[PDB]
Amino acid sequence: EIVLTQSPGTLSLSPGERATLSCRASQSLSSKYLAWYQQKPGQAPRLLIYGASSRATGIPDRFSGSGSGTDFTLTISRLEPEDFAVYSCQQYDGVPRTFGQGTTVEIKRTVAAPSVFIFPPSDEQLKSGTASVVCLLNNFYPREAKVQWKVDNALQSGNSQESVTEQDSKDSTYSLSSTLTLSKADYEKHKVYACEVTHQGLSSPVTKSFNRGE
């Protein structure tokens, strides 16, 4: 089967810049039989390019496509605010008709280090047999951030789940919330609960913490 791989994973550009997206085929691919799609958030996918270089009806002229053999590219001459979305390449020469993993076009901006907050469990949730400590990373850029839960300087794992907001429309920022969930029995056998945060915007990693009986 033909495998497509897309590059880059995430493309950080500014409004107005030119965007060059790449699709690589595991074997030579006639120009035809490669299409590009646009996935705007919450919306359905949309055809931009078919036949590698042919614009699709109603598609602005700032989208173009070229490439032959294994290397195909999508070019967005001048990025508009509505062009920041996810683009996928698809091969329909043979079967299966595979897709690339997608490339995310995000708005580039200045580095913004996160504001880190940590919330102890509610004394109500503790009336139940469960405890949830929440770490929040607010208004940072870029999106890359590692959050480490440290229960008495013990790296947790498998017991936390985190979520990331979309890139905000106004300040082009990201926000992240991590939730470490334990049982009251275990939760009450430790003292220190810490959120260790590392972000390219921070001189050094930041650790937010509280002690169980605080």
Binding site: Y37, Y50, P96, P120, Q161
Partner: protein
């Protein structure tokens, strides 16, 4: 200018089977048994995934290895409805499912897409949320919407008055098979102020207004 419309979201238990229908709205669609119909799915956080297609007139079907024997695509000439049926559902099937077609009876560029049908597979049962506060300790605070099913929930702040500094994160599937979610807001440290979030889980008719005090 064909437009595709898909059936609504479906919650299924493991081992069951589901059937999603694709139709054309208005009189924009032509003969349904004429065009090739393609189904693709999008697992959370993953890229587009080709499931299979059906030839327009002869109706010969091709599926991807990962779904062989598990999926049936079909098209009803008389009702003008394209179907996809996926059986032996696994929690790994929870994803957005798209319907698409091109211009001809043979597979090609997918010119037209539906808005997607979300199929959630959870052995869970409709369960209203429990709302716990994230107490303050600029300052941050929020509400934790824990262990609900199924999505979505709506979070306001002070009945829609407070809307500045607010981040309501995307929900997260925990091992338990239930949805957990966070909603936060950043406020002046010098506030005095009284904050309450308004959670609403429509399935369960649950309306919750919890206050947040330090």
């Amino acid at each position: 200018q064909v437009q595709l419309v898909q059936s609504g979201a479906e919650v299924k238990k493991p081992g069951s089977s589901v059937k999603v229908s694709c139709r054309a709205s208005g009189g924009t669609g032509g003969t349904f048994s004429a065009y090739a119909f393609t189904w693709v799915r999008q697992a959370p956080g993953q890229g587009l995934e080709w499931m299979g297609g059906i030839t327009g007139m002869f109706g010969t079907a091709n599926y991807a290895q990962k779904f062989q024997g598990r999926v049936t695509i079909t098209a009803d000439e008389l009702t003008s409805t394209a179907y996809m049926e996926l059986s032996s559902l696994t929690s790994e099937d929870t994803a957005l499912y798209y319907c698409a077609r091109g211009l001809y009876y043979y597979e090609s560029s997918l010119d037209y897409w539906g808005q997607g049908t979300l199929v959630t597979v959870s052995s869970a049962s409709t369960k209203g949320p429990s709302v716990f506060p994230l107490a303050p300790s600029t300052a941050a605070l929020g509400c934790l919407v824990k262990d609900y099913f199924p999505e979505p929930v709506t979070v306001s702040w002070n009945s829609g008055a407070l809307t500045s500094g607010v981040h309501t994160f995307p929900a997260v599937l925990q091992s338990s098979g239930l949805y957990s979610l966070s909603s936060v807001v950043t406020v002046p440290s010098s506030s005095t102020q009284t904050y309450i979030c308004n959670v609403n889980h429509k399935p369960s008719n649950t309306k919750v207004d919890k206050r947040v005090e330090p």
